[PDB]
């Protein structure tokens, strides 16, 4: 009906708790995943003889996980209320950053890589972090808890979203943010930005994917498209929306226990992938090969491939 | 691998905490060890349980706790006798019944719990059981558990302990709870009581409309007997079915009174005047 | 602390001896009386209630009135006069007023933990609150 | 929606705080075994245990398990040896 056939897939076991997030390295060789077990998951993935290994040292469950553009380092946000800097290929991590009053909501690297990484904490903290200086960048507070915070492609802007029920645009290098762009509604299922930088795709807790095209330069404050048809979160959940720039695609999780694939520019979605025993927490898309990482509450990562 | 657990004994709460039991008491019918699941539908209501095994629940095709008739939510006995005739051998020698049940379930490769629903074509007893069933009869189906200590005033705990005061009823007629629990399939029961209580030349029929035509009423009423004529009035959305013999007029008369559903639309049919008016 | 060990405790125990003697007399009187009132699991309530009363008396003497020396408090704790675990949970934020240690046992319950005696009356239903079967004890009026 | 922002901010603080209320990595520990009163369990159990009648009627099978386990009393009694060297 919707999905096309079945095709082979890879099931990744070993996660004690529900997987919080899933991501892949820029080279596509390894894929790391975070979960409630407070142990990062390194994976030899892109084809399977094996995954990679298990990473430890997190004092609490990792809320978010991401990899640096270089691939040798990665950042993670955990309930330990400390920014997690991890070196991986060296056998041990990077450094542990402190100063968060509450648990770290999300941590993502910027366009400068290890130089600065945008992060936020459920206390409502929106803060850039310098790393290689053995100290962060700067701290800021806007309204309320920011669910997701990520820097733009030019590293000069930082987009964030959370319980504040608004689209958060932040200017950074000016020691102040950018603008607050929101319609009339309150929902946050997550926040995301496209790779082109001309639009941002945020997840709405009403089960409504909101793609907004505004972009820098000429004033717009416009939108992109309204994606629907799949329920991302039933009541309250954190879903990481990762779009697939290959062709045109948008990947997201769902509370229906099915991976959510959405085509956008066609004014309709893509496909729904069943086979998950629980609600999908996060999904990823490999740039090199058409593979998608499936992280769900079932603690089993399902990586699909299109042939 | 849950039990039957129909919608009547589930309760109004969406979320329910149930505790399975691997080895429980033997089934009252199959007389074999099985799993015993316990849950409390109500806040202050007592926890439920299932005394029917997988073979006991599959043989009668009933809920593991309430043990109603099929999935229709009616009393077992009456609806079972209304299905065809009986089609059972509960009587005696469970050792001989263990071979028919073991070979039954072992030889049946098509079954399931709930990856399915409906998928039938009408029914003979769906109208009688549908008219004999209510909407979620969950009132006083779990908690009360009448206690004689509070009736005699000897209970020290009182309402703090379970079995709340003023629970019992007049020991005269069936107790509607433990009375059906005394036997299983044997008694006629309020199944049969409420079954008999549920059972109780021209014919006018209203509520036709544009969906119903004259050929449908002529073909439906023609099965009872020869029809003299039919008067189709579209302005009043009614039709008069005149039969030559009043026999079929009485059959289709009584059977056509608020029993008539044509193309999924109920029709109110009243007896013709025949008073020369 | 009625055992045969060689102690010679400080005079504080000699001053608090009548209280422990009365508690032991009430414990023996409660343990020597069966129940014909058709109650099985409810017969163990006054034992845990009296134990919590003695533990609350020792903890109230050492940690509030300050009328007992640290050596006497350690001799009473190591002598079996009071529960060290119940007093440990009483000193921290785990329990300010504790009924019994069995109510906090996670594995003792079929499904879940935290016997309803530990739930506040705010969220809990006052009609179905009644009393705990295991613990019971603390609280009277409603 | 300022009132909905403050109320939704408190409900969100109790929400994310409720998710962080676990404070256990892959689960937590269990209840540690504590010593019960000796006279309560000893005197009450052994007092009502040997009475049988309708009090121990449900305890019957439990006693069948007691007698059904030999090594408990053998290894317990043989394992308890105050010895003449002390008192």
């Amino acid at each position: 009906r919707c999905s096309s056939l079945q095709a082979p897939i890879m099931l990744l076991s070993g996660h004690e708790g529900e997987v919080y997030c899933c991501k892949f390295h820029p080279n596509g060789s390894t894929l790391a995943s975070a979960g409630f077990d407070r142990l990062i998951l390194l994976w030899n993935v892109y084809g399977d003889c094996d995954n990679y290994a298990t990473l430890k040292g997190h004092s609490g469950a990792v809320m978010e996980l991401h990899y640096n553009t270089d691939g040798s380092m990665l950042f993670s946000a955990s309930t330990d209320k400390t920014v997690a800097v991890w070196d991986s290929e060296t056998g041990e991590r990077v450094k542990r950053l402190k100063g968060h009053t509450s648990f770290v909501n999300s941590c993502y690297p910027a366009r400068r890589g290890p130089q600065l990484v945008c992060t936020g904490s459920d206390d409502g903290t929106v803060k850039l972090w310098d790393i290689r200086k053995k100290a962060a960048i700067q701290t800021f507070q806007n309204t309320y808890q920011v669910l997701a915070v990520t820097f733009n492609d030019t590293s000069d802007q930082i987009i964030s979203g959370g319980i504040d029920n608004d689209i958060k645009v932040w200017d950074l290098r000016q020691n102040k943010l950018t603008y607050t762009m929101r319609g009339h509604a309150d929902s946050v299922t997550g926040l995301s930005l496209s790779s082109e930088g001309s639009y941002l795709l945020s997840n709405a807790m009403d089960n409504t994917v909101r793609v907004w095209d505004v972009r820098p330069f000429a004033p717009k404050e416009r939108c992109v498209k309204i994606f629907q048809g799949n329920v991302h979160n039933f009541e309250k959940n954190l879903l990481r929306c990762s779009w697939s720039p290959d062709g045109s695609k948008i990947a997201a999780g769902s509370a229906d226990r099915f991976v959510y694939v959405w085509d956008t520019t066609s004014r309709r979605i893509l496909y729904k992938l069943p086979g998950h025993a629980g609600s999908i927490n996060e999904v990823a898309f490999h740039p090199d090969e058409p593979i998608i990482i499936s992280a769900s509450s079932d603690k089993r990562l399902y990586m699909g491939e299109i042939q | 691998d849950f039990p039957i657990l129909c919608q009547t004994c589930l309760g109004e709460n969406p979320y329910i905490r149930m505790t399975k039991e691997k080895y429980g008491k033997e089934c009252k019918i199959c007389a074999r060890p099985f799993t015993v699941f316990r849950w409390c539908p109500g806040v202050r209501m007592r926890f439920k349980k299932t005394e029917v095994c997988q073979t006991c629940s599959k043989l009668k095709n009933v809920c593991q706790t309430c043990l109603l008739d099929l999935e229709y939510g009616l009393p077992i006995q009456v609806r079972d006798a209304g299905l065809s005739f009986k089609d059972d051998m509960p009587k005696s020698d469970v050792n001989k019944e263990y071979y028919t049940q073991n070979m039954e379930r072992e030889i049946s490769n098509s079954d399931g719990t709930r990856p399915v629903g409906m998928l039938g074509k009408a029914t003979s007893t769906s109208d009688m059981l549908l008219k004999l069933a209510r909407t979620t009869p969950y009132y006083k189906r779990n908690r009360p558990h009448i206690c004689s200590f509070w009736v005699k005033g000897e209970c020290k705990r009182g309402e703090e302990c379970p079995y709340r005061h003023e629970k019992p009823t007049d020991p005269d007629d069936p107790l509607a709870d433990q009375n059906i629990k005394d036997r299983y399939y044997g008694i006629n029961d309020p199944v049969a009581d409420k079954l008999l209580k549920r059972a109780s030349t021209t014919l006018y029929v209203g509520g036709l409309g544009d969906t119903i035509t004259e050929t449908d009423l002529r073909n439906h009423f023609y099965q009872f007997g020869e029809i003299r004529t039919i008067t189709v009035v579209q302005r009043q959305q009614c039709a008069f079915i005149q039969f030559a013999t009043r026999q079929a007029a009485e059959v289709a008369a009584e059977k056509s009174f608020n029993k008539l559903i044509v193309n999924g639309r109920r029709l109110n049919v009243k007896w013709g005047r025949s008073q020369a008016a | 602390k009625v055992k045969r060990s060689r102690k010679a405790p400080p005079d504080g125990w000699e001053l608090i001896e009548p209280t422990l003697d009365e508690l032991d007399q009430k414990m023996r009187e409660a343990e020597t009386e069966p129940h014909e009132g058709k109650r099985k699991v409810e017969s163990l309530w006054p034992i845990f209630r009296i134990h919590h009363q003695k533990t609350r008396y020792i903890f109230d003497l050492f940690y509030k009135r300050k009328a007992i020396s640290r050596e006497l408090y350690e001799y009473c704790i190591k002598e079996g006069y009071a529960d060290k675990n119940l007093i440990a949970k009483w000193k921290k934020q785990g329990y300010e007023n504790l009924c019994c240690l069995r109510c906090i046992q996670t594995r003792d319950t079929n499904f879940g933990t935290n016997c309803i005696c530990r739930v506040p009356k705010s969220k809990l239903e006052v009609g179905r609150i009644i009393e705990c079967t295991h613990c019971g004890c603390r609280g009277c009026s409603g | 929606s300022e009132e909905k922002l403050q109320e939704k901010a408190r409900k969100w603080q109790q929400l994310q705080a409720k998710r962080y209320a676990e404070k256990r990595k892959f689960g937590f520990v269990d209840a540690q075994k504590e010593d019960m009163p000796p006279e309560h369990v000893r005197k009450i159990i052994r007092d009502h245990g040997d009475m049988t009648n309708r009090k121990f009627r449900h305890d019957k099978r439990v006693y069948l398990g007691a007698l059904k386990y030999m090594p408990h009393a053998v290894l317990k009694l043989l394992e308890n040896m105050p010895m003449p060297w002390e008192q």
């Binding site: 009541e235 629980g278 509450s297 079932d298 | 979320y15 905490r17 | 969220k123 | 409720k18 209320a21």
Partner: peptide, 22 residues
């Protein structure tokens, strides 16, 4: 399977007789 923490809030809402389908 779902989360156990979410089932605790669902049971707490069930004891409060919360029928909200939102």
């Amino acid at each position: 399977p779902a989360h156990i923490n979410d089932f605790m809030f669902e049971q707490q809402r069930r004891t409060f007789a919360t029928y909200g389908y939102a």
